[PDB]
Amino acid sequence: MRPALYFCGSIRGGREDRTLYERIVSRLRRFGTVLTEGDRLIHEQDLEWLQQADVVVAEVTQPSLGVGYELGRAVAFNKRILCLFRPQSGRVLSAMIRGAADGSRFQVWDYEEGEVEALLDRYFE
Amino acid sequence: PALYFCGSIRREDRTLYERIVSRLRRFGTVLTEHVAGGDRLIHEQDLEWLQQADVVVAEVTQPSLGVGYELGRAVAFNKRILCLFRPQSGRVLSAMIRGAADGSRFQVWDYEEGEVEALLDRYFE
Ligand SMILES: O=C(O)c1ccc2c(c1)CN(Cc1csc(N3C[C@@H]4C[C@@H](CN(c5ccccc5)C4)C3)n1)CC2
Ligand SMILES: O=C(O)c1ccc2c(c1)CN(Cc1csc(N3C[C@@H]4C[C@@H](CN(c5ccccc5)C4)C3)n1)CC2
Ligand SMILES: [Cl-]
């Protein structure tokens, strides 16, 4: 059985954010199966993918109620979670996400655009 | 009835949060106005307020990982939730929040700034 990996990022992410999302998702395929590969239907199916994940990887650089909501549901589902944040964006990460980290099943890793594949190789090995 | 309020930590939204809290005081104790690193302290205090609440009121106009996270945790705790969104902002509310609504235990209400007080009366009576 392959590990089930759930990726989440903002639907409002820009061109830079979306290039990094594709780079994270491409690298995730090496370590397991990426589950993703009206509004009520999106909510229900997203929660079903999330419930079936072994690991949740969230890119939390861009503020998002949807990503935050997925992280809150993921914690209550007892999921192992890795949050990836780019301090080069000029933003400060929400105290709720940074404060949810416990250094083990909820980690928040700051990163520079260039090292994302190397940080993902390290986390998943 | 113990009431929990949340809004984005990131002007016109900040004065609205004060009016919302003042109006909620008329219906019950607002837990969120009464009082490991700093982020973890904010997370833990916020979760203590959230677990003690009977009703969760969230201002969801500004995209926020923190507000979304609180809403995710609130749903999992089976809390009664009211989300307030201002369509005048020009934003499209996240599908995760709009899709979480069931018209009963979780409701999302579009409102106009001047009429927020009336909407809270209609909900709490
Ligand atoms: O920001 C919001 O308010 C929001 C609202 C709804 C959802 C999310 C975020 C994220 N959820 C998890 C998820 C799965 S794949 C993924 N990304 C991130 C970006 C780009 C691309 C496709 N995404 C997507 C996929 C399906 C439905 C909607 C958006 C959005 C890859 N994110 C899905 C539902
Ligand atoms: O958007 C974020 O990433 C974010 C990060 C952290 C928290 C929130 C949001 C919201 N939580 C709920 C809460 C309680 S009183 C409240 N509001 C909303 C605004 C203005 C004012 C003071 N707030 C506040 C109060 C205590 C601690 C921190 C911020 C923030 C009144 N919101 C608290 C923690
Ligand atoms: Cl946690």
GROMACS .gro file of C-alpha atoms and ligand atoms in nm:
model
  319
    1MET     CA    1   0.000   0.000   0.000
    2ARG     CA    2   0.131   0.343  -0.104
    3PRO     CA    3   0.127   0.631   0.149
    4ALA     CA    4  -0.167   0.867   0.076
    5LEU     CA    5  -0.052   1.233   0.044
    6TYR     CA    6  -0.286   1.529   0.060
    7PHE     CA    7  -0.155   1.861  -0.075
    8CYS     CA    8  -0.326   2.191  -0.004
    9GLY     CA    9  -0.270   2.544  -0.121
   10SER     CA   10  -0.470   2.858  -0.183
   11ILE     CA   11  -0.715   2.876  -0.472
   12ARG     CA   12  -0.625   3.254  -0.487
   13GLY     CA   13  -0.249   3.185  -0.522
   14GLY     CA   14  -0.065   3.389  -0.784
   15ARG     CA   15   0.173   3.284  -1.064
   16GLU     CA   16   0.476   3.247  -0.825
   17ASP     CA   17   0.269   3.052  -0.568
   18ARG     CA   18   0.124   2.824  -0.840
   19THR     CA   19   0.473   2.738  -0.982
   20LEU     CA   20   0.578   2.631  -0.631
   21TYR     CA   21   0.254   2.428  -0.586
   22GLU     CA   22   0.332   2.229  -0.906
   23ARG     CA   23   0.692   2.178  -0.784
   24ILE     CA   24   0.571   2.051  -0.441
   25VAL     CA   25   0.306   1.820  -0.599
   26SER     CA   26   0.559   1.683  -0.855
   27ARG     CA   27   0.803   1.595  -0.578
   28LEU     CA   28   0.527   1.445  -0.357
   29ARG     CA   29   0.450   1.185  -0.635
   30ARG     CA   30   0.789   1.024  -0.567
   31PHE     CA   31   0.697   0.938  -0.205
   32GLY     CA   32   0.336   0.822  -0.235
   33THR     CA   33   0.001   0.872  -0.405
   34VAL     CA   34  -0.128   1.230  -0.424
   35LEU     CA   35  -0.499   1.191  -0.347
   36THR     CA   36  -0.611   1.474  -0.580
   37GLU     CA   37  -0.428   1.294  -0.871
   38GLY     CA   38  -2.183   2.338  -0.569
   39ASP     CA   39  -1.956   2.461  -0.288
   40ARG     CA   40  -2.104   2.184  -0.067
   41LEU     CA   41  -1.975   1.915  -0.311
   42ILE     CA   42  -1.622   2.066  -0.307
   43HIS     CA   43  -1.633   2.077   0.077
   44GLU     CA   44  -1.756   1.713   0.108
   45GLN     CA   45  -1.508   1.564  -0.144
   46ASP     CA   46  -1.216   1.767  -0.006
   47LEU     CA   47  -1.295   1.633   0.347
   48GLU     CA   48  -1.313   1.275   0.211
   49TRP     CA   49  -0.966   1.307   0.048
   50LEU     CA   50  -0.833   1.464   0.371
   51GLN     CA   51  -0.974   1.187   0.594
   52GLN     CA   52  -0.798   0.926   0.375
   53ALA     CA   53  -0.453   1.099   0.396
   54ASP     CA   54  -0.157   0.966   0.591
   55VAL     CA   55   0.028   1.305   0.552
   56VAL     CA   56  -0.106   1.652   0.477
   57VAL     CA   57   0.138   1.900   0.309
   58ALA     CA   58   0.014   2.258   0.311
   59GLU     CA   59   0.177   2.562   0.146
   60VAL     CA   60   0.068   2.838   0.388
   61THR     CA   61   0.249   3.143   0.237
   62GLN     CA   62  -0.070   3.294   0.097
   63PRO     CA   63  -0.349   3.374   0.350
   64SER     CA   64  -0.651   3.146   0.297
   65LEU     CA   65  -0.968   3.053   0.491
   66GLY     CA   66  -0.990   2.730   0.288
   67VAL     CA   67  -0.629   2.616   0.367
   68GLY     CA   68  -0.668   2.719   0.733
   69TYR     CA   69  -0.999   2.524   0.748
   70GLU     CA   70  -0.830   2.214   0.597
   71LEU     CA   71  -0.550   2.240   0.857
   72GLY     CA   72  -0.805   2.267   1.141
   73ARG     CA   73  -1.000   1.965   1.014
   74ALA     CA   74  -0.666   1.776   0.959
   75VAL     CA   75  -0.554   1.834   1.323
   76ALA     CA   76  -0.892   1.705   1.454
   77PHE     CA   77  -0.854   1.403   1.216
   78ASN     CA   78  -0.516   1.327   1.389
   79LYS     CA   79  -0.318   1.374   1.061
   80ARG     CA   80   0.056   1.420   1.030
   81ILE     CA   81   0.099   1.767   0.883
   82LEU     CA   82   0.389   1.958   0.721
   83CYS     CA   83   0.333   2.333   0.652
   84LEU     CA   84   0.572   2.509   0.408
   85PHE     CA   85   0.608   2.886   0.450
   86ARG     CA   86   0.818   3.137   0.242
   87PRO     CA   87   0.939   3.425   0.463
   88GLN     CA   88   1.079   3.590   0.137
   89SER     CA   89   0.710   3.679   0.057
   90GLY     CA   90   0.724   3.960   0.320
   91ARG     CA   91   0.438   3.808   0.525
   92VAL     CA   92   0.427   3.697   0.889
   93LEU     CA   93   0.265   3.349   0.923
   94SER     CA   94  -0.058   3.344   1.135
   95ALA     CA   95   0.007   3.275   1.507
   96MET     CA   96  -0.257   2.999   1.481
   97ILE     CA   97  -0.050   2.802   1.226
   98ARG     CA   98   0.287   2.876   1.375
   99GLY     CA   99   0.138   2.804   1.726
  100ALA     CA  100  -0.015   2.470   1.615
  101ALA     CA  101   0.338   2.330   1.553
  102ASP     CA  102   0.466   2.075   1.799
  103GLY     CA  103   0.793   1.974   1.616
  104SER     CA  104   0.657   1.628   1.531
  105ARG     CA  105   0.306   1.556   1.386
  106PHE     CA  106   0.256   1.929   1.310
  107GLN     CA  107   0.563   2.105   1.169
  108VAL     CA  108   0.601   2.443   1.005
  109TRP     CA  109   0.916   2.473   0.791
  110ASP     CA  110   1.034   2.810   0.660
  111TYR     CA  111   1.187   2.783   0.312
  112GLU     CA  112   1.346   2.967   0.020
  113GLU     CA  113   1.205   2.895  -0.331
  114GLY     CA  114   1.524   2.700  -0.433
  115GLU     CA  115   1.539   2.436  -0.157
  116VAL     CA  116   1.175   2.307  -0.167
  117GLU     CA  117   1.262   1.970  -0.340
  118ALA     CA  118   1.555   1.917  -0.098
  119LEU     CA  119   1.336   1.990   0.208
  120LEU     CA  120   1.063   1.750   0.074
  121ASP     CA  121   1.331   1.475   0.011
  122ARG     CA  122   1.450   1.522   0.370
  123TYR     CA  123   1.100   1.518   0.529
  124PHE     CA  124   0.996   1.207   0.336
  125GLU     CA  125   1.315   0.999   0.406
  126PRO     CA  126  -2.441   3.113   2.648
  127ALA     CA  127  -2.060   3.137   2.614
  128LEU     CA  128  -1.983   3.314   2.287
  129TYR     CA  129  -1.658   3.301   2.089
  130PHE     CA  130  -1.574   3.569   1.830
  131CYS     CA  131  -1.300   3.551   1.563
  132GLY     CA  132  -1.176   3.782   1.296
  133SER     CA  133  -0.861   3.829   1.090
  134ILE     CA  134  -0.561   3.974   1.275
  135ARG     CA  135  -0.474   4.156   0.942
  136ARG     CA  136  -0.916   4.925   0.922
  137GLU     CA  137  -1.283   4.915   0.805
  138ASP     CA  138  -1.279   4.543   0.917
  139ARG     CA  139  -1.120   4.637   1.255
  140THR     CA  140  -1.400   4.882   1.357
  141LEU     CA  141  -1.665   4.624   1.246
  142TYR     CA  142  -1.506   4.357   1.479
  143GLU     CA  143  -1.558   4.597   1.773
  144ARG     CA  144  -1.927   4.656   1.683
  145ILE     CA  145  -1.981   4.277   1.642
  146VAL     CA  146  -1.829   4.204   1.984
  147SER     CA  147  -2.028   4.489   2.151
  148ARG     CA  148  -2.351   4.349   2.000
  149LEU     CA  149  -2.267   3.989   2.108
  150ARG     CA  150  -2.220   4.108   2.473
  151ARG     CA  151  -2.601   4.170   2.483
  152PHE     CA  152  -2.661   3.790   2.437
  153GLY     CA  153  -2.388   3.634   2.652
  154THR     CA  154  -2.034   3.622   2.784
  155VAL     CA  155  -1.779   3.688   2.507
  156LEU     CA  156  -1.502   3.441   2.600
  157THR     CA  157  -1.249   3.593   2.356
  158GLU     CA  158  -1.228   3.921   2.553
  159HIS     CA  159  -1.103   3.752   2.879
  160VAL     CA  160  -0.749   3.614   2.932
  161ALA     CA  161   0.585   2.712   2.509
  162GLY     CA  162   0.667   3.021   2.296
  163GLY     CA  163   0.442   3.315   2.202
  164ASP     CA  164   0.266   3.162   1.900
  165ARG     CA  165   0.192   2.844   2.102
  166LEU     CA  166   0.052   3.065   2.386
  167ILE     CA  167  -0.185   3.236   2.139
  168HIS     CA  168  -0.285   2.895   1.991
  169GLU     CA  169  -0.351   2.732   2.333
  170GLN     CA  170  -0.545   3.026   2.476
  171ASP     CA  171  -0.755   3.045   2.154
  172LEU     CA  172  -0.833   2.668   2.173
  173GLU     CA  173  -0.936   2.701   2.541
  174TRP     CA  174  -1.184   2.980   2.444
  175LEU     CA  175  -1.307   2.776   2.143
  176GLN     CA  176  -1.374   2.456   2.346
  177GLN     CA  177  -1.564   2.648   2.613
  178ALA     CA  178  -1.794   2.818   2.357
  179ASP     CA  179  -2.162   2.741   2.282
  180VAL     CA  180  -2.170   2.964   1.968
  181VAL     CA  181  -1.884   3.062   1.733
  182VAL     CA  182  -1.923   3.384   1.533
  183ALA     CA  183  -1.657   3.441   1.265
  184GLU     CA  184  -1.601   3.746   1.043
  185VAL     CA  185  -1.478   3.576   0.723
  186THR     CA  186  -1.445   3.873   0.482
  187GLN     CA  187  -1.063   3.891   0.500
  188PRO     CA  188  -0.880   3.569   0.394
  189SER     CA  189  -0.709   3.428   0.702
  190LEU     CA  190  -0.535   3.099   0.781
  191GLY     CA  191  -0.602   3.162   1.155
  192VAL     CA  192  -0.981   3.220   1.113
  193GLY     CA  193  -1.011   2.923   0.879
  194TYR     CA  194  -0.819   2.706   1.127
  195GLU     CA  195  -1.050   2.811   1.416
  196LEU     CA  196  -1.352   2.728   1.197
  197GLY     CA  197  -1.198   2.381   1.117
  198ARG     CA  198  -1.138   2.314   1.487
  199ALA     CA  199  -1.491   2.450   1.574
  200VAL     CA  200  -1.661   2.213   1.321
  201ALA     CA  201  -1.474   1.914   1.459
  202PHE     CA  202  -1.580   2.014   1.816
  203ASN     CA  203  -1.946   2.019   1.679
  204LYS     CA  204  -1.990   2.390   1.759
  205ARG     CA  205  -2.283   2.601   1.647
  206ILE     CA  206  -2.127   2.844   1.393
  207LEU     CA  207  -2.230   3.171   1.230
  208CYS     CA  208  -2.001   3.317   0.957
  209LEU     CA  209  -2.044   3.682   0.855
  210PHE     CA  210  -1.920   3.784   0.511
  211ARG     CA  211  -1.938   4.129   0.342
  212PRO     CA  212  -1.998   4.081  -0.031
  213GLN     CA  213  -1.935   4.460  -0.078
  214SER     CA  214  -1.561   4.380  -0.032
  215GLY     CA  215  -1.559   4.243  -0.390
  216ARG     CA  216  -1.411   3.911  -0.268
  217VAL     CA  217  -1.542   3.563  -0.342
  218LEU     CA  218  -1.573   3.374  -0.010
  219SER     CA  219  -1.375   3.044  -0.001
  220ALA     CA  220  -1.567   2.737  -0.120
  221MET     CA  221  -1.455   2.554   0.196
  222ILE     CA  222  -1.646   2.801   0.416
  223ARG     CA  223  -1.947   2.849   0.187
  224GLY     CA  224  -1.956   2.468   0.138
  225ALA     CA  225  -1.933   2.398   0.513
  226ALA     CA  226  -2.280   2.558   0.566
  227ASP     CA  227  -2.579   2.334   0.634
  228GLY     CA  228  -2.833   2.616   0.707
  229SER     CA  229  -2.856   2.510   1.073
  230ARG     CA  230  -2.550   2.425   1.295
  231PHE     CA  231  -2.323   2.607   1.039
  232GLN     CA  232  -2.456   2.917   0.862
  233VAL     CA  233  -2.289   3.176   0.640
  234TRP     CA  234  -2.467   3.513   0.611
  235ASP     CA  235  -2.387   3.785   0.363
  236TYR     CA  236  -2.434   4.125   0.535
  237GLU     CA  237  -2.400   4.499   0.474
  238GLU     CA  238  -2.171   4.686   0.721
  239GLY     CA  239  -2.447   4.917   0.856
  240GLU     CA  240  -2.690   4.629   0.916
  241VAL     CA  241  -2.454   4.392   1.111
  242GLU     CA  242  -2.629   4.471   1.444
  243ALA     CA  243  -2.970   4.378   1.298
  244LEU     CA  244  -2.837   4.043   1.165
  245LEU     CA  245  -2.701   3.949   1.509
  246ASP     CA  246  -3.045   4.029   1.665
  247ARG     CA  247  -3.220   3.815   1.400
  248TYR     CA  248  -2.982   3.524   1.483
  249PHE     CA  249  -2.981   3.547   1.865
  250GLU     CA  250  -3.364   3.588   1.895
  251LIG     O1  251  -0.803   2.878  -0.103
  251LIG     C1  252  -0.916   2.834  -0.086
  251LIG     O2  253  -1.011   2.904  -0.029
  251LIG     C2  254  -0.948   2.692  -0.119
  251LIG     C3  255  -1.078   2.653  -0.150
  251LIG     C4  256  -1.105   2.520  -0.179
  251LIG     C5  257  -1.004   2.424  -0.177
  251LIG     C6  258  -0.873   2.463  -0.146
  251LIG     C7  259  -0.848   2.597  -0.115
  251LIG     C8  260  -0.759   2.363  -0.140
  251LIG     N1  261  -0.807   2.225  -0.130
  251LIG     C9  262  -0.699   2.126  -0.132
  251LIG    C10  263  -0.620   2.120  -0.259
  251LIG    C11  264  -0.617   2.010  -0.339
  251LIG     S1  265  -0.514   2.036  -0.475
  251LIG    C12  266  -0.483   2.197  -0.415
  251LIG     N2  267  -0.409   2.287  -0.487
  251LIG    C13  268  -0.405   2.429  -0.449
  251LIG    C14  269  -0.477   2.519  -0.550
  251LIG    C15  270  -0.422   2.493  -0.689
  251LIG    C16  271  -0.445   2.346  -0.724
  251LIG    C17  272  -0.596   2.318  -0.724
  251LIG     N3  273  -0.665   2.365  -0.603
  251LIG    C18  274  -0.800   2.326  -0.590
  251LIG    C19  275  -0.838   2.194  -0.616
  251LIG    C20  276  -0.971   2.156  -0.605
  251LIG    C21  277  -1.067   2.248  -0.570
  251LIG    C22  278  -1.031   2.379  -0.544
  251LIG    C23  279  -0.898   2.418  -0.553
  251LIG    C24  280  -0.628   2.498  -0.552
  251LIG    C25  281  -0.369   2.258  -0.625
  251LIG     N4  282  -0.541   2.227  -0.302
  251LIG    C26  283  -0.908   2.199  -0.234
  251LIG    C27  284  -1.035   2.279  -0.207
  252LIG     O1  285  -0.597   3.605   1.135
  252LIG     C1  286  -0.517   3.540   1.203
  252LIG     O2  287  -0.421   3.470   1.152
  252LIG     C2  288  -0.538   3.522   1.350
  252LIG     C3  289  -0.435   3.480   1.432
  252LIG     C4  290  -0.458   3.457   1.566
  252LIG     C5  291  -0.586   3.471   1.621
  252LIG     C6  292  -0.691   3.513   1.538
  252LIG     C7  293  -0.665   3.537   1.403
  252LIG     C8  294  -0.831   3.528   1.592
  252LIG     N1  295  -0.851   3.455   1.718
  252LIG     C9  296  -0.984   3.476   1.776
  252LIG    C10  297  -1.011   3.615   1.825
  252LIG    C11  298  -1.028   3.650   1.955
  252LIG     S1  299  -1.059   3.819   1.969
  252LIG    C12  300  -1.048   3.832   1.796
  252LIG     N2  301  -1.054   3.953   1.732
  252LIG    C13  302  -1.016   3.959   1.590
  252LIG    C14  303  -0.885   4.035   1.570
  252LIG    C15  304  -0.900   4.175   1.630
  252LIG    C16  305  -0.925   4.161   1.780
  252LIG    C17  306  -0.805   4.094   1.845
  252LIG     N3  307  -0.772   3.966   1.781
  252LIG    C18  308  -0.686   3.880   1.856
  252LIG    C19  309  -0.717   3.847   1.988
  252LIG    C20  310  -0.632   3.766   2.061
  252LIG    C21  311  -0.515   3.717   2.005
  252LIG    C22  312  -0.484   3.749   1.874
  252LIG    C23  313  -0.568   3.830   1.800
  252LIG    C24  314  -0.765   3.965   1.634
  252LIG    C25  315  -1.055   4.083   1.801
  252LIG     N4  316  -1.026   3.718   1.734
  252LIG    C26  317  -0.745   3.492   1.814
  252LIG    C27  318  -0.610   3.440   1.767
  253CL      CL  319  -0.185   2.104   1.725
   0.00000   0.00000   0.00000
